[PDB]
Amino acid sequence: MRALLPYLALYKRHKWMLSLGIVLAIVTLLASIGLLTLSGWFLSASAVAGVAGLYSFNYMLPAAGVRGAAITRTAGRYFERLVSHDATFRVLQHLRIYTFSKLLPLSPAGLARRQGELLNRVVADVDTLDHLYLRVISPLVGAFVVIMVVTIGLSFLDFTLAFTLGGIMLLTLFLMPPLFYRAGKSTGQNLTHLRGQYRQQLTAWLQGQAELTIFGASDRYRTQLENTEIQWLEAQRRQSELTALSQAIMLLIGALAVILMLWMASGGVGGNAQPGALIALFVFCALAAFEALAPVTGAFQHLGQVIASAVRISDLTDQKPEVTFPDTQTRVADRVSLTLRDVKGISLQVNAGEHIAILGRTGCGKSTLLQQLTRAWDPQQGEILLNDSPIASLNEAALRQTISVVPQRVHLFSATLRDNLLLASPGSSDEALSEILRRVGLEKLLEDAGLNSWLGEGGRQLSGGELRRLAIARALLHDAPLVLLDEPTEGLDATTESQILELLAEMMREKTVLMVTHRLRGLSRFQQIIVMDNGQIIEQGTHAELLARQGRYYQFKQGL
Amino acid sequence: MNKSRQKELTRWLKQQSVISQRWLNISRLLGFVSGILIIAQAWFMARILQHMIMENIPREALLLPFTLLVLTFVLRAWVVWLRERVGYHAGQHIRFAIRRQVLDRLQQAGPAWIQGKPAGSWATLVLEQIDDMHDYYARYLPQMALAVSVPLLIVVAIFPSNWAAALILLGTAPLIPLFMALVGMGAADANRRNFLALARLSGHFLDRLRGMETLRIFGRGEAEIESIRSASEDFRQRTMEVLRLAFLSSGILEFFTSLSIALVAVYFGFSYLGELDFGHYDTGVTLAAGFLALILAPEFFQPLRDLGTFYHAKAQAVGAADSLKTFMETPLAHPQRGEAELASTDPVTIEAEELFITSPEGKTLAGPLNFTLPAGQRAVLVGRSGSGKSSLLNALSGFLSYQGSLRINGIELRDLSPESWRKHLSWVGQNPQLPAATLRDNVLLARPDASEQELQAALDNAWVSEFLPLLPQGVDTPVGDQAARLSVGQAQRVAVARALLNPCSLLLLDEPAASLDAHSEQRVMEALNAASLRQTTLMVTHQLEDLADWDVIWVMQDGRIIEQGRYAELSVAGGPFATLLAHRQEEI
Ligand code: HEB
Ligand SMILES: Nc1ncnc2c1ncn2[C@@H]1O[C@H](COP(=O)(O)OP(=O)(O)OP(=O)(O)O)[C@@H](O)[C@H]1O
Ligand SMILES: [Mg+2]
């Protein structure tokens, strides 16, 4: 369980709320054990006293303990629940922040390796780690402390009897949970195998339903899928076949303690040949003490899941980020001139204020040029300079301000239209915010619940043409001297494509625009067109220069 | 009764429980046996304890009551073991039937509806959410039957020995439902909405994780940590306000089980001292009656205190029943299933007259369509994205219902039986899916009983055999989940090989060469151009320059066919096609 150490240390932020919740859980159990033990002794003590001992019994002192044990149990249970639930929501909040703060400095590179379903495990693993306190730590620590307090306090009467009740209770806290976790390991492995095989077969049956029904194979794959459910439901049964045994044995152990207390305390308690009332003290302590052990066997099974979720999160967060940003201080320049040298070793100079287009064919060559221009990973090839200075010398706070990126995949957050644009500029007037929506031709989004309509999962899914316009709105809001266009006007119709290109030229006129495109629309406006294949610039120049020299750009315009 | 969503979902949960009433009745019968064995266990312990404490009898003389006490403990552990294996069966046979109902409905709806949600969204509904209901049926429902059998059976046992001790337990019996009616039921539905906010807060964290690439390039790392902090703290504060009311039920039940144990001890304690002379039946009060009442006083409230331990079993089944109840009740418009059958296997002729294509929810996908495709003539669909091109191919496959007239060889498509109509059909489709196990089974999906020669002929004709040596095991390579071993260019050729294996009357090709390599485009269209001349073909594409030889072109915009004709006349006409061709030729 050494995998839990990075997350146990997260408990230091709330170690008084977390430890109070455990204390209130122990105090409630000792009031349950105390009240029934004191009730059992009071009956036997007053029975043997009889009427003749009415005046000399002193029943006021037990009554003050019965009153206190009922209040302690009543209030302890109410605050056990409140404190331990408050603390569970505080642990989850600090786990979500810790996971996010460790996954962001390695955002593009570390998680690159299906990133869609990786995050559903991350979200589910943080939830499972949140269970370590109430589902695992609180029952196991509470049971151990309750057993010792009973064992210690009950030994002021008879050491032999206290140790044979605590010894039985300590044996089944330390020996019984591990013996059942080990017993069901073989079935718990066969249960995870068949669950992910059913998910694999189900998903392939729903995703390929058009192919399966057309080719007449939908019924015989539903059969194979419903046979994996039968195997899965049998592995689930054998897992309950063992949980039904861990609950019957816990009943027999707690029955053994009562039999032993009835038998062993019959001979004598301490030096007393006939214990009298002390027989019921030990029997009624053995009856109530095994309610503290009820959660522990199931609290150890879930410990295997919490450990498994702990290594998965630690495998991600304990990675080395590919880029390290120096902690220096820089003033963002109003004009950025970008120059590159030997990055399969391409060199280009982009003067401040001029636009540039890159004509790489997709697939034959992927432009990771914009990815290392935003420091997603360091360029092993050579040097990248920003405004006659190395890009690596800029701290992250100023690197972001000096480059605005419109990524090919526009992310629409589950948030209002205002929250999707205050992303770009942290503080923008509610009217200055609304002006950009009109400029980029997104006044339709202003028609109904403008700047308050929920976007994303909650509703209002944006179309491709309207979602490209939103990325440009973010770039225009986030005023940066250098703009990196990552394949804009791709997948859009001719009307929208021409609308965005004219929007790009009119709105971004005093900005250094570096565009990566595989189209040819509107490249006359761009000066110094760059054409490259597999990271090798064939030639370059303005629109007229390429046509005159009859290079590769000339045959592109000829349809060849 | 009650109009809250908590009670409406809980009513649905119980209606699904009649699938395994047989097991929920055995578990109820075994709860009466648990109540009887609890009372017998307490009566032996009280009878033993009286002999030792009052009569001073050595333990060796009480070998018969000790023996009977051990059997009662052994039988109790047997019933507990039996009652939980029976309990599992009740949950399992309900989830099997609900999972079968979800798969039946999601198969009847067809691919037109399954593609409305991601594949992982359906697996959550089928695996996680159906399984979230197991503990409600295996644990919570049996325990809520135990909470009325054992407490009532405890009282009937202590009544003959001492009626005053029976009133102490019985007096607290109606107060617990009384608290529920007043303030407990109100907080139960408020809790149901906090579990929705906790699931909604989990999607706010997943959203910030899915968009870390966007937050990184905008320098919003520190401002989303604060956004996470504020959302988390907002949830906790609102949830803790409700949980102050919801945790009173756990506190009140602990107050009544503490007051009743205290009252039993106090009343019996003073009855022995002579201060109180009521409650017994004039036969005198004994120590055995006191221990029986005191041993059974915790067990009177134990079924109710254990029902609060199973709270999340009900809370997560209601959250699952929230999603399964709407799924099973969303109105779906299934395309009409006919009884007709196509006469021959020759290429079919398609005629559409005022045809409208309707999605399962009811939305119109393709507007008025009027076209005719004589037998054996290849046709091309072109247009912008979202112009309804796939809807026409979905309708011809039988996946979407249509309001107009769409006749196959003079027979309406509604009247054609889908089982036999789809044997005369072969669709390559957009975003192809290889749902078999290995690459030999994906090709042989069209007919598994095919000779090895035809398998090789189909693999050669589709240019799949040329990259087979690159695969480790060859034709027996396992493609795996979503064909991770095959690239999108070479997984697209296996789809072609599957389509061409069987003869067909109509071949539908939807964006076959879209999003492939420059080499896989050549190989796919080389096979599909030659395979389109053997029967009636309807292809959807944006490779407008290659399609100079197809018989007819349908330029489709806004769900309607706005231009028809051959490529020779449409290219130079200057209409909708020329704009599309001009736009396409910009791509390099
Ligand atoms: C708001 C809503 C809610 C929520 C969210 C929650 C969330 C939660 N939770 Fe809860 N609970 C509740 C509401 C709730 N809850 C209640 C109401 C109760 C009471 C019940 C009784 O009576 O007992 C509890 C109770 C409870 C408990 C105790 C009992 C048992 O043992 O079973 C526990 C442990 C828990 C854990 C938990 C967790 C871990 C979590 C995380 C997820 N919890
Ligand atoms: N099952 C569906 N339910 C609801 N709307 C749908 C459904 N399928 C398609 N649509 C919508 O109907 C319109 C036409 O979509 P369709 O997929 O038929 O177009 P397409 O031209 O084939 O698409 P693409 O350009 O992506 O190939 C669009 O608005 C689309 O999002
Ligand atoms: Mg389509």
Swiss-Prot record, chain A:
ATPase activity is stimulated by various thiol compounds. The presence of heme leads to a further enhancement of thiol-stimulated ATPase activity, although a large excess of heme inhibits activity. Glutathione transport is inhibited by sodium orthovanadate, an inhibitor of ABC-type transport systems, but not by the proton ionophore carbonyl cyanide m-chlorophenylhydrazone (CCCP). Residues 20-305 form the ABC transmembrane type-1 domain. SUPFAM superfamilies: ABC transporter transmembrane region (SSF90123), P-loop containing nucleoside triphosphate hydrolases (SSF52540). Its EC number is 7.4.2.-. Residues 157-160, 270-275 are periplasmic. In CydC the ATP-binding domain (NBD) and the transmembrane domain (TMD) are fused. Part of the ABC transporter complex CydDC that exports the reduced low-molecular-weight thiols cysteine and glutathione to the periplasm. Export of these thiol-containing redox-active molecules may be crucial for redox homeostasis in the periplasm, permitting correct assembly of various respiratory complexes and formation of correct disulfide bonds in periplasmic and secreted proteins. CydC contains transmembrane domains (TMD), which form a pore in the inner membrane, and an ATP-binding domain (NBD), which is responsible for energy generation. Conversely, a more recent study suggests an alternative function of CydDC: authors suggest that CydDC does not mediate the export of L-cysteine but rather reduces cytoplasmic L-cystine to L-cysteine. The principle function of CydDC would be to maintain the reduced state of cytoplasmic L-cysteine, thereby providing an important connection between sulfur metabolism, oxidative stress and resistance to antibiotics. This is Glutathione/L-cysteine transport system ATP-binding/permease protein CydC. The lineage of its organism: Bacteria, Pseudomonadati, Pseudomonadota, Gammaproteobacteria, Enterobacterales.
Curated annotation (Swiss-Prot), chain B:
InterPro entries: AAA+_ATPase (IPR003593), ABC1_TM_dom (IPR011527), ABC1_TM_sf (IPR036640), ABC_transporter-like_ATP-bd (IPR003439), ABC_transporter-like_CS (IPR017871), ABC_transptr_CydD (IPR014216), P-loop_NTPase (IPR027417), Type_1_exporter (IPR039421). Changing residue 210 to K: Does not affect cytochrome d levels. The chain crosses the membrane at residues 16-36, 37-57, 137-157, 162-182, 250-270, 277-297. Disruption phenotype: Mutation affects cysteine transport. Inactivation of the gene leads to H(2)O(2) sensitivity and to growth inhibition in the presence of cysteine. Mutant lacks functional cytochrome bd complex. It is also defective in the assembly of periplasmic c-type cytochromes. Mutant is much more sensitive to the lethal effects of heat than the wild-type strain. Displays a cysteine-reversible defect in motility and sensitivity to benzylpenicillin and dithiothreitol. Mutant is hypersensitive to high cysteine concentrations and accumulates higher cytoplasmic cysteine levels. Induction: Part of the cydDC operon, which is highly expressed under aerobic growth conditions and during anaerobic growth with alternative electron acceptors such as nitrite or nitrate. Induction by nitrate and nitrite is dependent on NarL and Fnr. Residues 20-306 form the ABC transmembrane type-1 domain. Residues 339-572 form the ABC transporter domain. It catalyses: L-cysteine(in) + ATP + H2O = L-cysteine(out) + ADP + phosphate + H(+); glutathione(in) + ATP + H2O = glutathione(out) + ADP + phosphate + H(+). GO terms for biological process: cell redox homeostasis; cysteine export across plasma membrane; cytochrome biosynthetic process; glutathione transmembrane transport; heme transmembrane transport; transmembrane transport. Its EC number is 7.4.2.-. Residues 1-15, 58-136, 183-249, 298-573 are cytoplasmic. PROSITE patterns: ABC_TM1F, ABC_TRANSPORTER_1, ABC_TRANSPORTER_2. Changing residue 216 to K: Does not affect cytochrome d levels. Overexpression of CydDC confers resistance to exogenous cysteine toxicity. Part of the ABC transporter complex CydDC that exports the reduced low-molecular-weight thiols cysteine and glutathione to the periplasm. Export of these thiol-containing redox-active molecules may be crucial for redox homeostasis in the periplasm, permitting correct assembly of various respiratory complexes and formation of correct disulfide bonds in periplasmic and secreted proteins. CydD contains transmembrane domains (TMD), which form a pore in the inner membrane, and an ATP-binding domain (NBD), which is responsible for energy generation. This is Glutathione/L-cysteine transport system ATP-binding/permease protein CydD. It comes from Escherichia coli (strain K12). The gene is cydD.
